[PDB]
């Protein structure tokens with residue numbers, strides 16, 4: 001199973017999921033094709049599992065943090081920059097699969113809701129302690145900022161035109177987060 | 185031609201481009217199917233033209249503006265909220281078509297570059313006159329803010345989970361723009 005997952009992530013670096021066959025996956029894993037079907041129903045199920053592992057790893061890293069204001073936010077944004085930036089091929093294939101796969105769509109949406117709720121809870125705590133002003137509803141502010149990070153990180157990692165260069169994206173997002181949370 | 189375009193926009197309200205046939209389009213336009221092929225090579229070419237007209241209408245409305253700081257930005261963001269919000273079916277189909285169509289991809293990318301360049305020029309003017317502090321590189325700040333607006337507007341219009349409610353999205357974006365441009 002782990003060899004099929006590593007193989008899939010390796011090939012995804014080079015080509016889209018549409019250009020990878022079960023045969024390629026089976027072969028890279030040192031197993032036959034019907035032996036593949038024993039571990040996964042499809043190549044789409046492989047990507048789902050890869051995406052699930054990356055998002056959970058980001059989510060666990062953020063839990064570890066939960067357990068200087070600008071540096072506080074930078075470190076939390078950085079969990080996502082590093083975790084997804086270390087898995088760009090999976091990130092990119094997984095984002096494209098939100099369009100065609102309900103399971104990938106639901107997976108992404110469920111974790112965005114969780115990460116928005118955590119951001120909102122931290123902004124509310126900051127407001128409760130007098131460190132942040134009561135401007136926008138916290139949960140709405142958190143939603144826009146998180147959607148910004150999703151779109152901006154993924155555009156930078158994919159080398160999209162337009163995008164912020166990967167080496168400038170963390171400072172760019174942290175500035176927008178800190179000014180909008182503390183400003184006002 | 186205009187009847188084929190209106191028909192396509194009308195049907196897109198109800199269903200995806202994949203569930204619309206040339207026959208549906210031809211029929212709604214009061215023409216035969218080979219008569220359709222005379223005006224457009226495909227249903228994908230129809231969406232391209234619809235998207236082209238919407239983006240140009242937004243772009244022309246923003247030119248009209250180019251020819252109170254918070255209200256200045258609100259009015260510019262509002263061109264996009266109203267123009268795309270008045271054409272949600274076309275916006276939504278057009279965004280999904282960026283994945284499968286190079287012409288739709290290039291069209292969106294070309295206008296984002298133009299709208300980023302305009303935002304950056306206004307922030308630079310604001311900094312030149314002493315009204316905004318010299319924090320992030322203007323063009324990087326503009327890129328992240330514009331990508332935020334793209335993702336956040338389209339999520340609100342599609343009723344995505346998560347999204348900012350459509351009735352709160354303009355105030356949410358304006359707050360993030362004004363604090364990040366003038367803050368720090």
Ligand SMILES: O=C(CCC(F)(F)F)N1CCC(c2nc(-c3nccs3)no2)CC1
Nearest residue numbers: 065072076077080115118119122146149150
């Ligand atoms: O960037 C994200 C998530 C959106 C993305 F596309 F990237 F998946 N976040 C979500 C969690 C945010 C957050 N950080 C923290 C904290 N960081 C440090 C202490 S508490 N709380 O919420 C950081 C940015």
Ligand SMILES: O=C(CCC(F)(F)F)N1CCC(c2nc(-c3nccs3)no2)CC1
Nearest residue numbers: 249256260261264299302303306330333334
């Ligand atoms: O929201 C956008 C474009 C991104 C989108 F997804 F929506 F297409 N804009 C681009 C242009 C921005 C802008 N406004 C202005 C001005 N508004 C009033 C005077 S000058 N300059 O740039 C406003 C937000």
